[PDB]
Symmetry: C5
Subunit: 98 residues, 5 copies
């Protein structure tokens, strides 16, 4: 049950809408090769959270990390818009649902 | 119900007062043409949260994001003072109520 | 009740001590004329939270906002040292109590 | 009680190990000549939390603030390596305990 | 247990995967010899959280510290990828598990 606004914003062949995901793992990694921020779902799916140096994307990425860590802490579900082209798929948008 | 203070400030300007809103979705988006931070109400109404690069407004915008996210986690209601100029309407002021 | 330390530091020449305040609203506002961060108590008293652009005061002002929002979320009471020279009165020190 | 590691790092005559402290107030002050962040224990003990502009102490001092806040909100105890003179004392290290 | 993703990435013979660690202390230290951020587990094992002055690694190390603090606050277990060459061992990746 992603909002219709969230669905409308991720409605293209080059992006994957994924709905009602339970995230159960939140990962920070600064190892070589695998550095980044990730989440893993109850199913075992993995996404990478985008990072960005400057404004405005640095506001949105910081909020993606807060959404991700709140979902893992609370068990709230998220809906995601993600790039299918990248492995793990990179999150382009995320929706935290009560 | 909105504080008299908050109602008076919103009544100064042409923006519209919205009371007792229950926010159920919080969105961060870095897609190409819908980038931003947004909230979705229990009735499906959508608003964008103000963005600002610089001081002092970036203080207030950061707190609007925290108020948004707290309302979504807690189910606390919010009152908004929202501009109709844009789609979705932009939150110019918000009040978290316990 | 306010700590002796908090009370001793609130210089009565320049400010007044307010004890055992229950804050029930937290407001962020970016409108042109009512610009700022505020709190509203259970009795309708309003106060403006101080902001600063530079270190070190912006460490303290960030923590005033965290105390304010935590009090509204939790119902924990605060004590304030507030200047009466503006309306709303401005908070120059705040003490969150467990 | 304090970890052996924490005790080991605070084992000198000029700083005191203080264990099982209940913090019940958390103060932000920007007033003339008392500005700073402080905590008050259940028995009336006062400490200033250190402040630092630059890396790496800006990381640790920000974490000391979050530890103090969390202790006040949760009632979790802390252990401190602190100065041994009259209140208010300074803090060299702080351990939040579950 | 560790996600398959997490386990796959802790793949240097010089590194150690530790699973299902319950962290019970979170330390901020600004002493001269021992400055840093640490966690202590329910069995007394100690680790140092990595630090980084600059983007991008400072995004991940900030999230390491949020993961550690959340774990101590909630009792949620963590999985770590850590380096034995050090005393205390240094965390190069960490997975918070709901
Ligand atoms: Na006075
Ligand atoms: Na000592």
């Amino acid at each position: 049950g992603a909002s219709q606004f969230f669905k409308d914003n991720c409605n293209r062949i080059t992006a994957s809408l994924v709905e009602g995901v339970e995230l159960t793992k939140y990962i920070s990694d600064i190892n070589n090769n695998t550095d980044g921020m990730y989440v893993v779902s109850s199913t075992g799916g993995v996404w990478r959270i985008s990072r960005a140096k400057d404004y405005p994307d640095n506001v949105m990425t910081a909020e993606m990390r807060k959404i991700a860590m709140a979902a893992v802490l609370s068990g709230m579900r998220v809906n995601m818009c993600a790039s299918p082209a990248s492995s793990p798929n990179v999150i382009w948008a995320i929706e935290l649902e009560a």
